[PDB]
């Protein structure tokens, strides 16, 4: 889905802008309610679990060379057991923190790459569960 790639782009842009950066500095039933719920869910999650986002780039030894593997390792583990809306929010915040810090440490190249990995993962492994659960409208309802 393009709406999914749009969800990723929306969320990352939000997280980036939130720290002074602009998404355009690195890239070439309604969804507005969904984008908003996710944004909020993300802020709350990052707030309640600040520790897991402190020095991610350090906590994982991330470099443009190991970035993908690290990303995939974290995510495969996160969903190893299955899927929840909670894990999905965690999935988004993680990717967001990852981008924001890549930019902070002169690795801006990772931003768009991360978005791609997220969209790909979202579409290939999360989408089925999402739909089976009623689509994103279900999250908007169940969250706040």
């Amino acid at each position: 889905s393009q709406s999914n790639r749009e969800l990723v782009v929306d969320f990352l842009s939000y997280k980036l802008s939130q720290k002074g950066y602009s998404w355009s500095q690195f890239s070439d039933i309604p969804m507005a309610a969904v984008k908003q719920a996710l944004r909020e869910a993300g802020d709350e999650f990052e707030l309640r679990y600040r520790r897991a986002f402190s020095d991610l780039t350090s906590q994982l030894h991330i470099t443009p060379g190991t970035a993908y593997q690290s990303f995939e390792q974290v995510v495969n583990e996160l969903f190893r057991d299955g899927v929840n809306w909670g894990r999905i929010v965690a999935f988004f915040s993680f990717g967001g923190a990852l981008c924001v810090e890549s930019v902070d440490k002169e690795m801006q190249v990772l931003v768009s790459r991360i978005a791609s990995w997220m969209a790909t993962y979202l579409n290939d492994h999360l989408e089925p569960w999402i739909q089976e659960n009623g689509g994103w409208d279900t999250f908007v309802d169940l969250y706040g």
């Binding site: 679990y49 906590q59 030894h61 690290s70 390792q73 909670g86 894990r87 929010v89 965690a90 169940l142």
Partner: peptide
Amino acid sequence: APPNLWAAQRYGRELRRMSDEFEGSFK
């Protein structure tokens, strides 16, 4: 997976724990 990726593994496992608790926090 090589040791260089085990940290990412533990991190993912911890992430799951925090999001399961978060999940349990919903309406």
